[PDB]
Design a protein around this nucleic acid. Sequence first.
RNA 1: CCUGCGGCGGCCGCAGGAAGAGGAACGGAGCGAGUCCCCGCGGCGCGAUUCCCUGAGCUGUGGGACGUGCACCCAGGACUCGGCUCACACAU
Lengths: 64, 64, 91, 94, 357, 341, 330, 129, 129
Amino acid sequence: MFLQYYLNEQGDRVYTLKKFDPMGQQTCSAHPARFSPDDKYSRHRITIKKRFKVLMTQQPRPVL
Amino acid sequence: MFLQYYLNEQGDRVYTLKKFDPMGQQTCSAHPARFSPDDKYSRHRITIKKRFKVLMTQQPRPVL
Amino acid sequence: ERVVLLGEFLHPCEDDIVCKCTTDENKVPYFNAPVYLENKEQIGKVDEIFGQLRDFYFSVKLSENMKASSFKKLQKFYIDPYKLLPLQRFL
Amino acid sequence: PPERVVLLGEFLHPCEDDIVCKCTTDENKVPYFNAPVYLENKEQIGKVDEIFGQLRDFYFSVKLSENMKASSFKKLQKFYIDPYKLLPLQRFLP
Amino acid sequence: EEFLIKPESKVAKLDTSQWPLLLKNFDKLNVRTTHYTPLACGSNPLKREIGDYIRTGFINLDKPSNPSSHEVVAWIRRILRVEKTGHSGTLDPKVTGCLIVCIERATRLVKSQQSAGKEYVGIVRLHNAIEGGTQLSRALETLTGALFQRPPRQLRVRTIYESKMIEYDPERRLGIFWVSCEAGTYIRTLCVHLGLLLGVGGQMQELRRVRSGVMSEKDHMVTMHDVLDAQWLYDNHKDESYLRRVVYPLEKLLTSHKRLVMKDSAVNAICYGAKIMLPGVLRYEDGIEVNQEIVVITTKGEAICMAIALMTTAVISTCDHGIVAKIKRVIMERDTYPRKWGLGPKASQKKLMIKQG
Amino acid sequence: DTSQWPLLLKNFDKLNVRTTHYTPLACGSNPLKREIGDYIRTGFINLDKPSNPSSHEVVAWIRRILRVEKTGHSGTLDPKVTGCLIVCIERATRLVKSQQSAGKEYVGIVRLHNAIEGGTQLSRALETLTGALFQRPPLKRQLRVRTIYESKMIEYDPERRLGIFWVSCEAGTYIRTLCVHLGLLLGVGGQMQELRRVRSGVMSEKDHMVTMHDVLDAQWLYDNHKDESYLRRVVYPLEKLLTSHKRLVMKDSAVNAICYGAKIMLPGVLRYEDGIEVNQEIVVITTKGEAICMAIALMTTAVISTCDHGIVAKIKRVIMERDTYPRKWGLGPKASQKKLM
Amino acid sequence: FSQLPRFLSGSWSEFSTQPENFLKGCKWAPDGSCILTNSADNILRIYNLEMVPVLRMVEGDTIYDYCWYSLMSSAQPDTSYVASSSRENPIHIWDAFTGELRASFRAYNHLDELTAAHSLCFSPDGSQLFCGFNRTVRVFSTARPGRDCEVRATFAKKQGQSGIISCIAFSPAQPLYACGSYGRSLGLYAWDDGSPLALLGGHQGGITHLCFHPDGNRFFSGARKDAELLCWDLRQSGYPLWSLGREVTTNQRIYFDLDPTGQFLVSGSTSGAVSVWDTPEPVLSFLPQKDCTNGVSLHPSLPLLATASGQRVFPEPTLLSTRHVHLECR
Amino acid sequence: QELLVNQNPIAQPLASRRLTRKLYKCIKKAVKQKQIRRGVKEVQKFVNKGEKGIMVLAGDTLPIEVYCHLPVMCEDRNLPYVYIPSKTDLGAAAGSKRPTCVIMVKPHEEYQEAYDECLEEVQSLPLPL
Amino acid sequence: QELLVNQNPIAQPLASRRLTRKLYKCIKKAVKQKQIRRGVKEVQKFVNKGEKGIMVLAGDTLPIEVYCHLPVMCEDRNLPYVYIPSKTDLGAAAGSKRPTCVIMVKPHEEYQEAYDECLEEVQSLPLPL
RNA sequence: CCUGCGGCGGCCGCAGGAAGAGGAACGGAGCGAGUCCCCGCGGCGCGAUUCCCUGAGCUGUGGGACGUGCACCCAGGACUCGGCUCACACAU
């Protein structure tokens, strides 16, 4: 895949075709990770996400 | 009775099984003293605690 | 049979040529409708129709493997009025 | 012994002269207490005593029968239980 | 000292600005009457029991690049153990983007969600070199507005509102385009037309969907791993705190329309199918027009159906009786609230008068 | 400045103002400033239980030395187990059931019979025991389910094979069985050596704890010097353990009606709190600030903002005594015309 | 024992790594293959015959007792195992060849709690494993290890023998066995039923050891702080027959025993002086070292002897442990 | 060049600067033979079936959901792992231009002393909470 | 070696360094005979029945509620007392490893002059005020 | 006539209703009882030779033997009531 992006200060995606943010950071892939329906590693993902406190539960609640 | 503890800078129990503070101080036991229903030394306890200004009354009031 | 003006030459693609569709009240031609010159020999059939509703284009595939250089920068094809449809049908 | 038997669980490792078995059985059914455990040959080897673990995938242990050793069994093993003994887990669901 | 809430005389206004998603700003609503009897039925949308909360929910999902939309929908339906599930519009089995996934009871507005303005971003590759970089932008601005399109076979007409290119690579002949289009528009045909205009030829290599109706990517986006993680976490730990971050109530799709609060008795009558008559109305938002799309809601803030407005705000402010609006699409389950319509002064005397003769 | 005001009356400024007019009365008192006769009758003690005595005997000692009529505790601790225990004095035993089913915590020590690789293995075996789990009484043979929210490892001692674990669990779970299961998991074995409750419900061990030498000293000092400055630091009012609920402020004429048993009605309501849902337990407080009753809500915080009359909640349990405010029901803008009829 | 037995060998280097350490007894195997050693590190050591141990069986908190299997033929691996009791852990059983755990016997209270055994001893037939608890002894069976047992009540509700039972022994002559308690009493119980048939007393301290004579009529006993070694008999019922003399200053077990032939009796002492008798007349007395001498064992097949050293030190604000072996001449 | 930017939130436990070169040389000498594993997929199919060894993870890979389960199947089987800064350099060491996020190393006789030194170094790293 | 840390707030009056040694030697000489009292239970039991002597208390006992009543139980009978820095050293002087908080020394003729000089020094101790 | 669902922009099939939108005390509290649930080898003090013990037996911040006495083994919740009491309350 060729689609790359880097977030600016406002916090929205800025899509680009290069590999480096003009300030000198690498760019993520705009597409998500591939998914297998018969996956079994939810526990393994949950444990690390909890341990490093980057889980979506630990994030502040969205504004409503 | 193996359980010990010591207080950190923030002032809460930091449970440990050793007998010394990481800074070389002794660690208090985690249990309260034995109690007898028909104790007769209340006056003796109160007068000394008053004398040394360690009675609970002389401590600043908790916030509520 | 007399035929009606259809399009003009714009530029050649890698395979076909690109034509600007100018006609009476901007009528849309049939798909793969045969296109003729004033000398009545056919040049090809229109590949597809695209562009804006009021001003749109169309590309015709060449016949007999003529080179694209045979057409001048602005020539003017011709099509029979029978093989075309009115614009207001779609709107 | 019963005429038919059902998959119960697999051997994992022994603990203090007792075998500790993972529970891999049809659906999530749970065994009784003091329910005889049978091998592929439909012969008694023990009894279920201690059930523990999460509700989804739990463990259980077996008290070995007479003249049975906790070293006889293989690392991966397979045990059978009388179907008249199991009960559904909808009771333990809220 | 002495602590007591002293009595005052000056009035104090409520502050409903930070209230929940559809209960927002009842203070700004014009008020007709405040005399009715509420019942102990229904609940706030945000605080439903998790069962009823996932039935009337939706997922702003990020679609994985390998499968198709109909396969993704089946995956989610299998994960959540729901019965029915729709989506916001089919995507090619190779493109990614945002795909709103209406769960069992939120499917009723899938047709309204499908026919909504959408946005796309993608990559076009050219077979041969171009004069420069701005030629692509120039040829992109030429082809916009109402356009002729074909399904890649009857020719159809769609429109494109605005377009822009981000950057172009002269070495790989690659450019990124940003487009805003109606529902059903084809982008592969757009790339083909761009190539034909340039006189070079082109094709669509990559394409991602950014905006899908009201929900965007700068929003509570959810990947396919998140749904499985949430369901497993619930099943194992009995912790619902992660499901409520992927599943949102359907009322979040309805926060740009006009509101019309309704009595408790007037609720179940509309669900069974009935006109919207003046006595049931309690509060109404200003700015209503005729033949406009409005959403009527209960006092608790949950949408009951969708309506087409007959009287404007001024007429409904100054009127004696009439018909407020006509049903468009009924959203709530039928017997949520109890049904009580035959009771009342006018209806009672009417079915009494006709009883006599 | 309103955040410094007392409990169940703190931050009342950030409430939904319904009306601001009522007739203030002179009866009733603040919770902290009550007469010492009733400040004790409506109170709880955040104890620190000793080891030797049982649980149904420490409260007996507390009753027999405080000279009261009825007492109840939060969670039954077996002898040799210490830590937080909440004892309620008779007019507070109403709130016992909301205390006996709460989120407990523990700190213990497990004695592993045989040597293992180290502390990482035991921490992993702890992590594999989290969430709903099967349990069984340590000592009626029945299998039930209890939940363990969290776990952690404090320290490990390889020489003595001693491990300290912190557990956030629910009410009814058995650590004396969790340790046996954890021993069975590692294959080596285990038993429970040490146990201590660190948190019971809302009252933690960080603040407001007293030993039973404080309770005896306060009683002696009061009985002899007629000084009660020390009992005020040992006993705390009921409102201390109702601070997390949803509030509902009323006016003086409604208080005695509710205490007699009339359902809350919107004409009597004075202020209501943002975030009330149907079938949610709320607290009904007086203008002084005082727990009138435990009320099951019946009108979402938005329904209240629109309607003008009707049932607003029904009472689950009423706390105050029958005659604490005068009878002021039966005389208002309405309900008097019906008497004229 | 003509004069001053000769010094063969010894082991002293391993115990020096500990700032304080001491030995807690020694026992020969029932055939003579190897010795068993206890230390203050709770580590067991086996020496085969400076000696170096072939095994190091690390334990838990504090080892109350241990014993060899009652048959212990070195040809067959299945009879070569050693039992062990610790402060809180159950009755571990180890493999005497590779030094790994084999089985485990567990003792559970009435409140379902684990109660360690203070004294354990196998049976002459080798099938059962008796243990020693507070006012009770719990029979077991080597076949079918586990938690099942057969509680025997040493002290009935009214009468009997109280205190922690600290030593168990059997009599080859008749089906009888005896137990000793920290409550300064000796009991006699039948094997089949377990009904008490006598009781004994006359010690000034907690009884720590027993022994029996090949004839079975005579048997001896020791104590914790009593200087005497009582000499009993099972035929006369006149409980005390003779007495001996030794120094017992501390509250630690001092090991005595009796020769394979059945006539020589050896015993340790706190001063560190070993003393010998003949069967009640002293024969020899020699000093293996200056420190305490607690463990004494006699080889069953050939004339040999080993001694253990060590004692606690009590300091105030402001000397080695050795294992020795000696050659004798019966 | 040492720029410790654009690291995953789960980058710990990161390798030391010298351990980077040591692991690079070990992976090189393992690629000279057929005792090496490449790709997440092969990593799952060959870690599940035993094959105890070393696994090296890239520290600048996003999204993190592509390989997040490896640092838990490791403890489920008591295998060691360690993170390294870059994936392009890791792929270059592995012997290709396209980068990779996971590399698994297996023991062999030729680099046995270096492999054992790296294995004991990895298990001595500090443990993040 | 005199670090004044980990002391109870009721430590005063504190014995000096040389006085500490004198008390330790006196306790040794006293425990040479059976004229000694060990433990709160025994000291409290036998203060009730008179038996005048000298009381020494451990200065680092926590919690203080086990023996806090002794400084005034002495005053009700007019007995001298003093605090020594450590309890482990007090147990060592008593002739044991396990520490204790209170030791009550009784007079006897063997150590009478040292006991008397210690007693007259204790009465000469000052007060914090 | 209206709405919901299914079937091949429209049609067909089945199902629900036919609907102007009530009620400013109807139906409660605090107790007690019956039925279910919840959950006497212990705990405290004293006496007697300094009653014994720094045991490798946990322990002097205590452990054990004999005489002794004492106190603690509940309070909450659901169901029924063919029960008592207070009220039957829209809050000026």
